[PDB]
């Protein structure tokens, strides 16, 4: 990554790599892997991100899907940023193509040149956006359950049922409004009768804290 | 390595060495070892790379093959960079021979002198290129399987079969186009009938995500 008043470049540390590898091996494609990745690659260059993606042993199907997603994003970027004709002036620097953002046709010094520019051309955060999108699609695709199937057991504590519910919801393929609707509908809709009657008695304007406090005794 | 605005030299850390050694002991010559190596030797000098290669216990056949590959690369470099006659001027510095790039006939201060020059003579990244080439040949040679033999089991989930497929493909000895052909042909060609019919029905213009979503139920 590159950290701050001038910016300074440093390679990815051994324990950032080890951390990422062990996270992939232990948790595979759980939702919380996406923040960890973004946490382990803050300020990183395309070379660092490609380093983290190449160090993945196994899971080659998911890595291929991620490759295809990055291909879509880079192609769209090239569509939105057309090529221009001429040699680059001595003072200036060319604008990054989709292949340069992925670190394929760009050196480390060119990426540092884009990220250190004023105004900055944040190639690392753009490439990070594409990668994180692909990771979203992989996580949502490898989710075994559906939000519609989460139902509270007869003798299951309300806390556990809500845990399962939002656990499944976090990996769902839905926009913000759709998740709002799922929360305001299926949660009370799929609760067990003893607690479901109480939650219906509370009303749709109740907080989760009041719902879990209400069904704590049952 | 040497990190950045002036460059500063630092030796390889204890946990970079320990990381590399443990990676070699655990994973031996798996594909993902090559990025890790390149991740553990970013900005490194020939002395650091030779340090990482010399700390390998066992696997002496592979290390010998790597030695021979480096010999080929250095000989070719000397062919492309002919010797010149005369003493070096006080202000200037000689151009590195193939033996200097491998750190054999060059001191640490001379390598720092080549990497700190403007324009830089990146001896460490060149030597790194030769080493990574040799590692490619070792990985491809120690691959037990072939891309032609990967076939989906009758009751094997499509995800697992694709995982095996690209796992074997990553270690294959083939150019980019040959791997494109292998992907666009053998993957659907070697799938089990129930899923193979669906993948044939999709058409050759389908993404891997649509193929794995299509064969998820079966």
């Amino acid at each position: 990554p590159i950290v701050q008043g001038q910016m300074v470049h440093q390679a990815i540390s051994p324990r950032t790599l080890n951390a990422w590898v062990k996270v992939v091996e232990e948790k595979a494609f759980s939702p919380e892997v996406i923040p960890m990745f973004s946490a382990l690659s803050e300020g990183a260059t395309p070379q660092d991100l490609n380093t983290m993606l190449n160090t993945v042993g196994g899971h080659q199907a998911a890595m291929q899907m991620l490759k295809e997603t990055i291909n879509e994003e880079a192609a769209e970027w090239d569509r939105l940023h057309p090529v221009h004709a001429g040699p680059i002036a001595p003072g200036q620097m060319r604008e990054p193509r989709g292949s340069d953002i992925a670190g394929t046709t760009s050196t480390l010094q060119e990426q540092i040149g884009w990220m250190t520019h004023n105004p900055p051309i944040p190639v690392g955060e753009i490439y990070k956006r594409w990668i994180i999108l692909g990771l979203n699609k992989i996580v949502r695709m490898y989710s075994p359950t559906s939000i519609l199937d989460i139902r509270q057991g007869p003798k299951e504590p309300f806390r556990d049922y809500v845990d399962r519910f939002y656990k499944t919801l976090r990996a769902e393929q839905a926009s913000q409004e759709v998740k709002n609707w799922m929360t305001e509908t299926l949660l009370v809709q799929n609760a067990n009768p003893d607690c479901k009657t109480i939650l219906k008695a509370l009303g749709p304007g109740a907080t989760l804290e009041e719902m879990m406090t209400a069904c704590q005794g049952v | 390595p040497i990190v950045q605005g002036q460059m500063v030299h630092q030796a390889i850390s204890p946990r970079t060495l320990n990381a590399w050694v443990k990676v070699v002991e655990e994973k031996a010559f798996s594909p993902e070892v090559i990025p890790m190596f390149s991740a553990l030797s970013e900005g490194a000098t020939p002395q650091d790379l030779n340090t990482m290669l010399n700390t390998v216990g066992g696997h002496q056949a592979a290390m010998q093959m790597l030695k021979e590959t480096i010999n080929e690369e250095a000989a070719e470099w000397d062919r492309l960079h002919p010797v010149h006659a005369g003493p070096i001027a006080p202000g200037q510095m000689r151009e590195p021979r193939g033996s200097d790039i491998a750190g054999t006939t060059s001191t640490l201060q001379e390598q720092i002198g080549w990497m700190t020059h403007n324009p830089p003579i990146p001896v460490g990244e060149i030597y790194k290129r030769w080493i990574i080439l040799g590692l490619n040949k070792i990985v491809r040679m120690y691959s037990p399987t072939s891309i032609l033999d990967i076939r989906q089991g009758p009751k094997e989930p499509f995800r697992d079969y694709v995982d095996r497929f690209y796992k074997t493909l990553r270690a294959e000895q083939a150019s980019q186009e040959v791997k494109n052909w292998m992907t666009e042909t053998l993957l659907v060609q070697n799938a089990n009938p129930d899923c193979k019919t669906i993948l044939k029905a999709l058409g050759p213009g389908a993404t891997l995500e649509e193929m794995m979503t299509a064969c998820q139920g079966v």
Partner: peptide, 12 residues
């Protein structure tokens, strides 16, 4: 395309 099957990430 920028990435290809069986090829490393960020490779020319």
């Amino acid at each position: 395309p920028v990435l290809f099957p069986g090829q490393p990430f960020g490779q020319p």
